[PDB]
Amino acid sequence: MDIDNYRVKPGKRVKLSDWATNDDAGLSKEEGQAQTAKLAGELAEWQERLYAEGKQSLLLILQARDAAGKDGAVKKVIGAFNPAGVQITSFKQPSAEELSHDFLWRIHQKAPAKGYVGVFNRSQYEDVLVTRVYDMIDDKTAKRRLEHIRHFEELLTDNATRIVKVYLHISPEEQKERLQARLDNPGKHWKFNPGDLKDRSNWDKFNDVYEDALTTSTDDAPWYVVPADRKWYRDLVLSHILLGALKDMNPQFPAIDYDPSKVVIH
Amino acid sequence: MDIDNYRVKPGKRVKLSDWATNDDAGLSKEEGQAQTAKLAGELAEWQERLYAEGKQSLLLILQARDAAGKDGAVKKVIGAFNPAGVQITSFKQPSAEELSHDFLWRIHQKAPAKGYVGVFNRSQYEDVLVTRVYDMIDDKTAKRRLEHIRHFEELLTDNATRIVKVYLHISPEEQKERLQARLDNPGKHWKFNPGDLKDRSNWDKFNDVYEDALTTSTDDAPWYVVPADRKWYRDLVLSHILLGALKDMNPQFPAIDYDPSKVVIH
Ligand SMILES: Nc1ncnc2c1ncn2[C@@H]1O[C@H](COP(=O)(O)OP(=O)(O)OP(=O)(O)O)[C@@H](O)[C@H]1O
Ligand SMILES: Nc1ncnc2c1ncn2[C@@H]1O[C@H](COP(=O)(O)OP(=O)(O)OP(=O)(O)O)[C@@H](O)[C@H]1O
Ligand SMILES: Nc1ncnc2c1ncn2[C@@H]1O[C@H](COP(=O)(O)OP(=O)(O)OP(=O)(O)O)[C@@H](O)[C@H]1O
Ligand SMILES: Nc1ncnc2c1ncn2[C@@H]1O[C@H](COP(=O)(O)OP(=O)(O)OP(=O)(O)O)[C@@H](O)[C@H]1O
Ligand SMILES: Nc1ncnc2c1ncn2[C@@H]1O[C@H](COP(=O)(O)OP(=O)(O)O)[C@@H](O)[C@H]1O
Ligand SMILES: [Mg+2]
Ligand SMILES: [Mg+2]
């Protein structure tokens, strides 16, 4: 498996219909789940080093259509970290107070502190996604917002916040099956809403604006297009992406001023 | 396994030396962990109902000496919940801004919203624990702070915030072994701190101030004294305490405004 094949290279426009939704890297589900469990132990150790060092941060941004696995990826993969070192924000419809500020005001508030992992389940990119499809903003505004988003990510990068953006890529048939499973389950009815159907009738428009959003992929702030039809494969790929980032960040335990083997506990 | 025997009944003062630190209810680690795994599924389901209902909240407060298992309890038990529905705060030494306010200002800010589980890893009780042992405040101030804490918990209860306070109870010998394991393990040296030895020399003074703090136990805002020398037993007992609270709160899925069998997904 080469996860760099899922990275959007800078300057290369994405045509999503040419990107796989259903990869398995030749692995069975059981092999994939076992590898994910092993990576979870490494994710925990590297995140503990990140916290103890207190010099850098990691920001994971998740965007995806409804039912494409944002909630599941956070549970399964972000669940590998110590929850004391993680701040997860699920960005919903802007409140009245948030709308009275610039669109990055509420986003910047949640940028992670030194030593922490930040996770945006939805993010600044919502302001150039649904808002474009339903004509809440026009193209001129959307282009300007994408520029402001690039500048914001450059600001965080220079603050030693390592940025990873992940689009979970599922097929329309797979989304239909997952949405049907919500309708069928009385304990999941509360998660099906009329907007689900409206967004499906705008599937191709959403492709267009997601492909515009993916143009912010840079070497410092990459987008990944993760094939997510197989939930276990989504979790495996995301685990690799996050572990590669942490290993590259290479946090170190701080120096200590004593010899641990000589400490006497009474 | 009668969890209510660990509850501090109102007005019944605790003498911690008479409470066991190392119960196992006749279970092994394998047996206890299998029960905890089955309770985790039930915790996830009841927390999803709490969130979907959006009317009530759950607040878990943890206090314990260093190495007594706050971090582990949060990972193992709170990890059963969907992290999208949980807010964990690890309260550290008050900042200059926090000290310029009353002691409950920073605590009140983190009280949970409707639909959420809040976890205070340390809490308002720190202001009547370490502060008393080292004479940062006197008895008169400490008694007044305990009254304000009582009043604060009453305010949250009346807001349908279900309060559970948990003291993790370990023996001095157990703490010594766990601290030694930090000294012995290169990946854990960073968690050994000079305060560890100073507080041990003040073990009995801390018993006194914890027993005073435990007097805020009420039917509405109970303290539990959990035998925590066995880490798996700590997790089993805490799982029961939280599941009992959620089942009693009895959150209901909300009514929906459509017929799921009549929805047609194209
Ligand atoms: N800046 C924004 N402008 C408009 N809508 C936004 C913005 N940020 C988030 N939203 C919307 O808020 C809603 C949150 O809905 P909810 O928490 O119920 O999840 P959801 O419907 O399952 O979302 P998703 O479609 O991403 O899976 C989503 O429809 C999302 O598109
Ligand atoms: N158990 C839960 N506790 C708290 N919030 C939850 C829970 N289940 C779902 N939610 C929230 O309800 C909304 C709808 O859930 P949904 O399953 O669509 O999640 P999601 O994060 O949008 O993922 P997906 O990409 O699969 O749609 C989201 O805002 C999610 O955060
Ligand atoms: N209100 C408060 N006043 C003074 N000290 C406080 C207060 N709240 C928290 N603290 C202290 O902040 C410190 C946080 O330290 P740290 O995060 O390293 O954890 P720790 O040393 O493992 O804590 P613990 O002894 O609770 O296990 C603790 O020593 C705690 O007692
Ligand atoms: N992997 C981690 N990521 C983030 N914060 C961590 C991590 N490990 C420990 N911490 C924090 O560092 C401090 C010391 O850790 P420690 O293991 O003593 O935890 P704790 O919550 O105090 O538990 P205990 O009751 O066992 O002392 C605490 O503030 C803890 O929350
Ligand atoms: N698990 C326990 N371990 C040790 N002592 C306890 C425990 N539970 C209660 N006690 C002590 O026993 C005495 C009476 O407790 P109480 O809560 O009235 O018992 P119950 O309600 O079960 O009859 C008090 O001194 C109390 O501190
Ligand atoms: Mg969704
Ligand atoms: Mg500690």
Coordinates of N, CA, C and O and ligand atoms in Angstrom, one line a residue, chain B residues 64-67 70 91-94 106 122 126-127 130-131 193, ligand 3:
Chain B
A64 N -8.4 11.8 42.4 CA -7.6 10.7 42.8 C -6.1 11.2 43.0 O -5.7 12.2 42.3
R65 N -5.4 10.5 43.8 CA -4.0 10.8 43.9 C -3.3 10.4 42.6 O -3.9 9.7 41.8
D66 N -2.1 10.9 42.4 CA -1.4 10.7 41.2 C -1.1 9.2 41.0 O -0.8 8.5 42.0
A67 N -1.3 8.7 39.8 CA -1.1 7.3 39.4 C -2.3 6.4 39.8 O -2.3 5.2 39.6
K70 N -7.0 8.0 37.0 CA -7.9 8.9 36.3 C -7.7 8.8 34.8 O -8.7 8.7 34.0
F91 N -8.3 19.6 34.4 CA -8.0 20.9 35.1 C -6.6 20.9 35.7 O -6.3 20.0 36.5
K92 N -5.8 21.8 35.3 CA -4.4 22.0 35.8 C -4.4 23.2 36.7 O -5.4 23.8 37.1
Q93 N -3.1 23.6 37.0 CA -2.9 24.7 37.9 C -3.6 26.0 37.2 O -3.4 26.2 36.1
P94 N -4.4 26.7 38.0 CA -5.1 27.9 37.5 C -4.1 28.9 36.8 O -3.0 29.2 37.4
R106 N -13.8 29.2 36.1 CA -13.3 28.3 35.0 C -14.0 26.9 35.0 O -14.0 26.3 34.0
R122 N -10.0 16.0 37.5 CA -9.8 17.0 38.5 C -10.9 18.1 38.3 O -11.6 18.1 37.2
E126 N -10.2 20.5 43.6 CA -8.8 20.9 43.8 C -8.6 22.1 44.6 O -7.6 22.3 45.4
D127 N -9.6 23.1 44.5 CA -9.5 24.3 45.3 C -9.8 24.0 46.8 O -9.6 25.0 47.6
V130 N -5.3 20.3 47.5 CA -3.9 20.7 47.6 C -3.8 22.1 48.2 O -2.8 22.3 48.9
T131 N -4.8 23.0 48.0 CA -4.7 24.3 48.6 C -4.8 24.2 50.1 O -4.3 25.1 50.8
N193 N 7.0 13.6 38.7 CA 7.1 15.0 39.1 C 7.6 15.1 40.5 O 7.4 14.2 41.3
Ligands
LIG3 N1 -7.4 24.6 41.7 C1 -6.2 24.2 41.8 N2 -5.3 24.7 42.6 C2 -4.0 24.2 42.6 N3 -3.5 23.2 41.9 C3 -4.4 22.7 41.1 C4 -5.7 23.1 40.9 N4 -6.3 22.3 40.0 C5 -5.4 21.5 39.5 N5 -4.2 21.7 40.2 C6 -3.0 20.9 40.0 O1 -2.6 20.9 38.6 C7 -1.7 19.8 38.5 C8 -1.8 19.2 37.1 O2 -0.7 18.4 37.0 P1 -0.6 17.3 35.8 O3 -1.5 17.7 34.7 O4 0.9 17.1 35.5 O5 -1.1 16.0 36.5 P2 -0.7 15.1 37.7 O6 0.5 15.7 38.4 O7 -0.7 13.7 37.2 O8 -2.0 15.2 38.7 P3 -2.7 14.3 39.7 O9 -1.8 14.4 41.0 O10 -4.1 14.9 39.9 O11 -2.6 12.9 39.2 C9 -1.9 18.8 39.6 O12 -0.8 18.9 40.5 C10 -3.2 19.4 40.3 O13 -3.2 19.1 41.7

